[PDB]
């Protein structure tokens, strides 16, 4: 949570453990590349879990997760999605973002 942290950690990092009123303020430690990330500075002792790009959803990875940037998905070859956000892609019936 961080109510007792005086100092933030920058993107890509997290507090080693929760701050407390008596403990020496914990150092920042890096998120696990490929697994977790923080795209924004924060006062917490947790990173966020990298999302997945599930094939069964017609997705694949476009950019792998980095310590500071959540995974970026895209449609698979021959699938497409109209909306700006795409919980999934459907088979071209065409760009990865358009249907023909």
């Amino acid at each position, epitope marked *: *949570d*961080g*109510q*007792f*942290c*005086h*100092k*933030p950690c*920058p*993107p890509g990092e997290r507090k080693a453990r929760d*701050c407390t*009123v*008596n403990g020496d*303020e914990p150092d920042c430690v890096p998120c696990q590349e490929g697994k977790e990330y923080t795209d*924004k*500075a*924060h*006062f*917490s002792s947790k990173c*966020r879990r990298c999302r997945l790009c599930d094939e069964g959803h017609g997705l694949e990875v476009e950019i792998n997760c980095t310590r500071t940037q959540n995974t970026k998905c895209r449609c698979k070859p021959n699938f497409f999605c109209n909306s700006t956000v795409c919980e999934h892609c459907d088979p071209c019936t065409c760009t990865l973002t358009s249907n023909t």
Partner: antibody
Amino acid sequence: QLQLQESGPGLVKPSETLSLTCTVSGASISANSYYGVWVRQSPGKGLEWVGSIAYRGNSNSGSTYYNPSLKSRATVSVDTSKNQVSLRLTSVTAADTALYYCARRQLLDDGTGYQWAAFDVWGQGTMVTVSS
Amino acid sequence: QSVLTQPPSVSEAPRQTVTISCSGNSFNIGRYPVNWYQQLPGKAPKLLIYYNNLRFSGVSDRFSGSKSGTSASLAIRDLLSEDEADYYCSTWDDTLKGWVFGGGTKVTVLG
């Protein structure tokens, strides 16, 4: 809801200790936790954060963090029975003349799980002049 | 100078728009979100924008904030006389290991 009110002597002499009080109303600073700060403003000039206390009512203790440029001249503390946070500044000089504000630091949601800190409630400010 | 640089003054006619820049470096804005405070003549600062672009409770949607790289920006559209005030940006600085504020920007609605 929360309201803050600063008070203290308006004139202090150099080498002497400056003492200020910040009185919390509309809530109890010992109910849960309370993060208080002091911020000062030399007349016609900008803002400068002085220091902080992160205070936990149930253990009646807080931890402090100070602006390094104050060279350890600043201390902040809590008097829970008066709902007050205080500032003490030692060895003051002319450069310490300023409007002194107290404020609360709150972790604010962004609506997507993230929080960031801001000074969301401020006192009215008390003016302090340092002169021999 | 403050580690965050703001123009001392911006202005425009009523109903127009002004933009206030706030520039830092890789150890402050480059890493951390920016908050903005509004200080009316003779009053204390109050929270205006937090976390780059979120309006604090009560704040008019005429105020908007953004951040890019090592700079942040506050824009006030459809200006009214009541908007005349000093505006301060603020963030954490890892070189100084503390909270920092820009030097402040006075807004004038040209009369």
